[PDB]
Amino acid sequence: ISWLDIYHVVSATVPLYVSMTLGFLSARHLKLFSPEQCAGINKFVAKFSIPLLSFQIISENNPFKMSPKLILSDILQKFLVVVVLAMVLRFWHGGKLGWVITGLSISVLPNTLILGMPILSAIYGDEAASILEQIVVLQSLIWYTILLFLFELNAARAGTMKILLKAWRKLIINPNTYATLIGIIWATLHFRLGWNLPEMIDKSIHLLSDGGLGMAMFSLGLFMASQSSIIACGTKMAIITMLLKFVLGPALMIASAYCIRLKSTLFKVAILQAALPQGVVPFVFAKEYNLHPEIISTGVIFGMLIALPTTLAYYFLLDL
Amino acid sequence: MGISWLDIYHVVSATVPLYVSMTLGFLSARHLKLFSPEQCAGINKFVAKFSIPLLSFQIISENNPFKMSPKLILSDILQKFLVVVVLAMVLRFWHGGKLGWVITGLSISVLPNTLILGMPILSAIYGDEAASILEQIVVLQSLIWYTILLFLFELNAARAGTMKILLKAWRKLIINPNTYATLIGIIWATLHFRLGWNLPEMIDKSIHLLSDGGLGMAMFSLGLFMASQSSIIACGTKMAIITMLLKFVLGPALMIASAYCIRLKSTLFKVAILQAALPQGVVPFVFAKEYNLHPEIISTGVIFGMLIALPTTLAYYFLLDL
Numbered sequence: 001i002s003w004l005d006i007y008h009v010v011s012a013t014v015p016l017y018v019s020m021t022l023g024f025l026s027a028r029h030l031k032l033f034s035p036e037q038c039a040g041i042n043k044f045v046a047k048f049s050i051p052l053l054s055f056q057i058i059s060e061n062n063p064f065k066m067s068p069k070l071i072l073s074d075i076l077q078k079f080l081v082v083v084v085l086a087m088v089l090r091f092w093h094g095g096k097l098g099w100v101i102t103g104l105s106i107s108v109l110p111n112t113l114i115l116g117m118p119i120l121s122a123i124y125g126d127e128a129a130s131i132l133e134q135i136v137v138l139q140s141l142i143w144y145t146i147l148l149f150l151f152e153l154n155a156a157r158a159g160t161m162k163i164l165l166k167a168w169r170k171l172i173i174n175p176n177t178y179a180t181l182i183g184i185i186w187a188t189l190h191f192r193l194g195w196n197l198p199e200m201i202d203k204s205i206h207l208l209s210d211g212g213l214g215m216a217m218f219s220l221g222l223f224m225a226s227q228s229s230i231i232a233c234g235t236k237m238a239i240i241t242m243l244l245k246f247v248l249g250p251a252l253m254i255a256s257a258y259c260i261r262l263k264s265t266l267f268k269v270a271i272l273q274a275a276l277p278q279g280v281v282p283f284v285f286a287k288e289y290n291l292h293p294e295i296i297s298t299g300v301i302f303g304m305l306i307a308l309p310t311t312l313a314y315y316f317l318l319d320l
Numbered sequence: 321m322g323i324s325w326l327d328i329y330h331v332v333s334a335t336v337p338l339y340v341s342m343t344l345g346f347l348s349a350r351h352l353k354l355f356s357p358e359q360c361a362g363i364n365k366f367v368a369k370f371s372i373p374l375l376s377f378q379i380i381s382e383n384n385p386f387k388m389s390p391k392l393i394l395s396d397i398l399q400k401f402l403v404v405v406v407l408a409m410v411l412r413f414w415h416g417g418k419l420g421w422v423i424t425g426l427s428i429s430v431l432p433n434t435l436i437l438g439m440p441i442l443s444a445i446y447g448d449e450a451a452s453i454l455e456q457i458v459v460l461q462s463l464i465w466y467t468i469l470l471f472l473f474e475l476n477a478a479r480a481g482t483m484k485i486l487l488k489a490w491r492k493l494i495i496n497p498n499t500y501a502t503l504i505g506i507i508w509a510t511l512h513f514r515l516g517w518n519l520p521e522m523i524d525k526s527i528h529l530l531s532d533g534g535l536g537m538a539m540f541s542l543g544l545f546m547a548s549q550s551s552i553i554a555c556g557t558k559m560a561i562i563t564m565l566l567k568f569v570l571g572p573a574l575m576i577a578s579a580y581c582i583r584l585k586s587t588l589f590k591v592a593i594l595q596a597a598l599p600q601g602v603v604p605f606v607f608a609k610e611y612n613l614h615p616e617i618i619s620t621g622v623i624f625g626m627l628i629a630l631p632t633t634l635a636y637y638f639l640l641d642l
């Protein structure tokens with residue numbers, strides 16, 4: 001609400017768009033980076049910046065003060081989206097497991113690590129910062145882990161003991177699997193035994209992680225410069241990729257946030273963290289398994305350009 | 321002894337973080353084999369185009385032009401003039417392309433790392449009064465010397481009458497992001513500190529996002545480059561010693577000569593000589609890697625320069641008072 005409060009959001013999103021536009025312009029118009037060089041800037045951002053940035057969000061989580069209702073509310077949204085994606089597909093209006101993972105990656109996996117903290121913190125202050133760290137840990141540890149094992153069922157089933165090992169061979173090498181497993185072994189050791197990182201270790205991690213939230217958008221602009229067409233695939237798959245992340249997604253967190261009885265800041269922060277642009281980690285899997293890679297990208301390169309117009313719509317709605 | 325055990329630790333505390341970033345790059349291109357040689361250029365092309373230019377703007381814009389000591393600007397300029405005279409004179413005799421060697425001579429001799437390794441060290445050996453003397457020397461590097469150096473990198477690459485070459489070298493200098501970063505940086509520092517204008521929070525945050533991890537990428541890029549060399553001493557044991565007799569002997573020695581000529585006072589004299597003996601920076605390498613002007617000699621100095629930086633820096637500290 002208000003008119004100045006609307007400025008605290010535009011002022012917190014523009015910095016994330018100036019970096020995004022300085023990447024797209026540096027790959028299409030300026031012709032500064034060659035296509036193969038653009039894959040090196042993204043690889044460094046996907047293996048050294050994001051994993052190190054997830055260590056500073058997961059480490060400061062206080063696992064001993066994690067709400068049992070919010071955790072049981074995210075577990076309910078995903079289960080209430082499966083029952084919606086496992087029923088709509090039934091009527092289709094077959095290889096349906098292929099079309100489900102594409103629906104569980106476009107709707108219930110928002111970008112909280114990069115866009116969740118800056119945009120939403122500027123909306124609700126520092127009282128909505130710990131409510132998103134609780135999500136980053138769950139998405140990094142469970143949802144991204146329950147999706148990677150759910151992707152492996154399409155590269156094989158098209159038994160099960162040969163799937164978990166085949167999925168565990170891709171987790172033991174994934175950089176984000178060690179930050180999410182060491183960032184929770186340190187948080188449990190720093191908030192209980194009071195073990196604080198030495199200055200050398202702490203600063204050694206900031207040198208790379210500090211420029212990771214602005215670099216994650218520069219790489220995204222570079223990717224948005226790779227896709228020649230702004231909206232790939234027919235428009236019948238571009239309005240269903242935007243009505244599936246900003247309507248069905250949040251409208252099923254409103255059903256789980258009123259059944260688990262979430263109230264107060266914990267409520268208005270959980271329904272707004274869902275109405276955020278789709279994350280790109282799910283797209284990383286898509287290409288790696290060729291599961292509609294061009295249907296998720298359109299949800300990202302177009303889910304980002306409608307990030308501010310729609311965030312203000314749900315922030316206003318949550319204010320009655 | 322004046323130096324305290326907490327000061328030696330602070331010296332290491334400001335150096336190890338750079339090695340961690342550098343080591344990750346090294347192991348990320350030699351053992352794990354992640355980045356191809358072309359991709360390694362992309363990371364270096366981003367540092368020289370988006371990070372370094374933005375760091376230059378922040379350094380220059382946050383300094384007060386109307387409070388830079390005139391004596392320290394003359395001493396800094398005089399040191400560079402003497403060094404180029406020695407480098408130009410020595411190269412002529414022997415006490416190929418000689419302009420490339422002069423750039424590599426000033427890039428490892430008169431461009432210390434006074435921003436990230438100078439402040440933690442000199443602020444530990446001297447009080448905060450010495451943290452302001454190094455701010456006018458870090459601003460000078462971004463404004464004058466780096467801008468001049470980027471012209472010599474173009475006046476060199478454009479040579480492979482002289483008026484046409486200079487025009488071509490200039491024509492590529494204006495398009496450089498660094499030139500506009502410094503030009504805008506100084507134009508802002510004048511307005512902010514003389515009129516009281518404040519940079520909008522949207523233009524200050526936006527710059528921070530694309531510049532905060534610039535140091536990490538620079539060290540990371542250096543590790544990537546060293547992942548391709550056959551040995552850590554990529555220039556040989558002979559040119560790896562001459563890269564030290566320049567930075568830690570010929571650098572400060574000529575700085576002392578300039579300080580005497582300008583007649584610097586007590587605190588200003590000491591802080592202006594130790595800063596010249598500081599370990600070599602990475603910006604001279606970032607430009608030497610992109611223009612392919614002997615990046616091997618510059619890089620090996622950066623690595624071993626930091627190791628030998630503590631023994632030499634203390635030596636100068638004990639060598640000035642008594």
Ligand SMILES: CCCCC/C=C/C/C=C\CCCCCCCC(=O)O[C@H](COC(=O)CCCCCCC/C=C/C/C=C/CCCCC)COP(=O)([O-])OCC[N+](C)(C)C
Pocket residue numbers: 047048051052055173174175176177178179182183185186198200201204205336340344352354
């Ligand atoms: C005072 C000592 C002086 C300092 C020395 C210490 C330096 C370490 C500090 C910072 C650097 C940390 C390493 C980052 C490596 C880059 C990312 C990377 O490399 O990803 C991972 C490893 O890392 C990570 O996942 C991120 C880890 C970051 C957090 C953990 C490290 C920091 C230490 C914290 C202390 C906590 C202790 C708790 C107990 C833990 C018990 C297990 C390696 O896979 P990959 O990404 O290379 O490629 C893999 C893909 N493919 C197969 C294609 C090549």
Ligand SMILES: CCCCC/C=C\C/C=C/CCCCCCCC(=O)OC[C@H](COP(=O)([O-])OCC[N+](C)(C)C)OC(=O)CCCCCCC/C=C/C/C=C\CCCCC
Pocket residue numbers: 022029030031032369370373374377494495496497500501504508519523
């Ligand atoms: C007298 C000279 C003529 C002046 C003409 C008049 C106005 C010019 C406009 C000035 C405003 C800033 C211009 C920024 C563009 C830099 C110049 C440029 O076109 O090049 C783009 C540069 C990469 O150059 P390139 O050679 O590598 O590729 C370009 C060459 N080719 C196409 C062949 C590959 O990339 C980038 O600009 C992005 C990365 C660099 C970012 C540096 C930002 C520095 C800070 C600026 C101020 C910021 C905010 C405002 C300050 C507060 C005031 C409200």
Ligand SMILES: O=C(O)COc1ccc(Cl)cc1
Pocket residue numbers: 042045046050110111112113114216217219220278279280281282
């Ligand atoms: O984790 C997310 O969803 C957003 O973080 C990223 C942004 C860009 C790339 Cl290239 C990879 C990850």
